[PDB]
Amino acid sequence: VEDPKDFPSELLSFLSHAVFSNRTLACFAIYTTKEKAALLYKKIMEKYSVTFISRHNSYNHNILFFLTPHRHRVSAINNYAQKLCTFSFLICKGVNKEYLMYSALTRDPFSVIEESLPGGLKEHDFN
Amino acid sequence: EDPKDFPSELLSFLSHAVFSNRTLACFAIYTTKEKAALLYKKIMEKYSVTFISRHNSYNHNILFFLTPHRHRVSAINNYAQKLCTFSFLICKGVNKEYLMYSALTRDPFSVIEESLPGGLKEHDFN
DNA sequence: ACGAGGCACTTCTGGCCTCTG
DNA sequence: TCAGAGGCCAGAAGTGCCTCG
C-alpha cells in the first residue's frame, strides 16, 4: 500500500531496466524497510562475498548498494533476498551506473548509515 | 500457526507416508477459517475437483476433496502453501475416503459448505 | 491395501554467450 | 562498448507413472 512501488525517481537513470534479459551483472541495489536492511546487509555480504556493500537512508526506508566479484542474475539476488522476508516490501534491481548510483546515495536526500569500505567507489577502484 | 496435526480421531483415515512417490485422489487440509474459505474456491478451480467440502474442526476448519486425476500429496501441499500467509496448514492424503468424509459430517465435526447439494453418500465411494 | 522407491519427464534456476541498435 | 532480448545449458526441483513388498 504506502510501500514504494519503485526505487526513488532520482535513482532510476542508474538502475537496470531489463524485464526479459538473462544478462548477469556485478552491481545490485535493494530497496526495503529499515528492519530488513540491517539483516540483509550481513546475509548478502556473506552470501555473495561482496567486494563492497553500503546501507543508505531513503525517504523513511533504506537502500543497500553492493558490488560482487562474480556475475549474478538480478532474479537470483531477488530470490535469495525474498526468502528472508515475506512479509515486507523489497525492490531488487541491477545497477548500470555504479559510480553515479553510489555517489547519488551519499548526497541529499540520501545518506550513508554504514558501509564496508569508508568512502566507497569515490576512494576505491573496484576495477 | 496453532494445531500440529489432524485431530487424533481422524488419523486412522489418512496417509502418513513420507517417502512415497504414490499419487492419490483424496486429500484433506487443516487450516484457519479464512484460509479454508479461500482454498475451497481455489482448489476447486485449480484441481477441478469432483467434490470438495469445508468443515468445522476444533477452533479451525478442515477441507476434504476428491480430484478427478491423481496427485502427489506434495503437489497439493506446494499449491496450498502458496496461498498462505504464515498461517498454519496440515495437508494429507486420504486413504479411507468415505469414513473420513462421514466422520467430518458428525460430532465433533459439521459441514459448512460442499460442492454437491446434500453432500456425499456411501455409494459414490469405491 | 499402502508405504517405499525406481523412473521419466518437465519446469525452474541461474549461469554462460551473441545479437542488435 | 552498452544494455536489453533472448538462445542455450546443466543441475536441481517438481510432479506424475509404475512395481515391489
Residue numbers in the entry:
A (entry chain A): 132 to 258
B (entry chain B): 133 to 258
Question: Can you list sentences taken from the study reporting this PDB entry?
Answer:
The crystal structure of the SV40 T-ag obd (amino acids 131–260) with duplex DNA containing two high-affinity binding sites, P1 and P3, was refined to 2.4-Å resolution. Pentanucleotide binding site P2 has been altered to abrogate site-specific binding. The asymmetric unit contains two T-ag obd subunits and a DNA duplex 21 nucleotides long. The two T-ag obds are oriented head-to-head on approximately the same face of the DNA and make almost identical DNA interactions with their respective GAGGC sequences. The DNA positions the obds such that the residues within the B3 loop (amino acids 213–220) are facing each other in an antiparallel fashion, with Phe218 from one monomer and Thr217 from the other are close to one another but not quite contacting. Two residues within this motif, Asn153 and Arg154, make most of the base-specific interactions, with the pentanucleotide binding sites (P1 or P3). Residues adjacent or within the B2 loop (amino acids 202–204) interact primarily with the DNA phosphate backbone, with only Arg204 making sequence-specific interactions. The site-specific binding of the T-ag obd to DNA buries approximately 1,600 Å2 per GAGGC pentamer. The interaction of the two obds on P1 and P3 induces a 17-degree bend in the DNA.
SV40 T-ag is a 708–amino acid protein containing at least three independent functional domains: an N-terminal J domain (amino acids 1–130), a central origin binding domain (obd) (amino acids 131–260), and a C-terminal helicase domain (amino acids 266–625). In the case of SV40, a single virally encoded initiator, large T-antigen (T-ag), can bind the SV40 origin, assemble as a set of two hexameric rings, and cause local distortions (ie, melting) of the DNA. The T-ag obd recognizes the GAGGC-containing duplex DNA at the origin and also binds double-stranded DNA (dsDNA) and ssDNA in a non–sequence-specific manner. In this paper we describe two crystal structures of the SV40 large T-ag obd: one in complex with duplex DNA and one as a dimer in the absence of DNA.
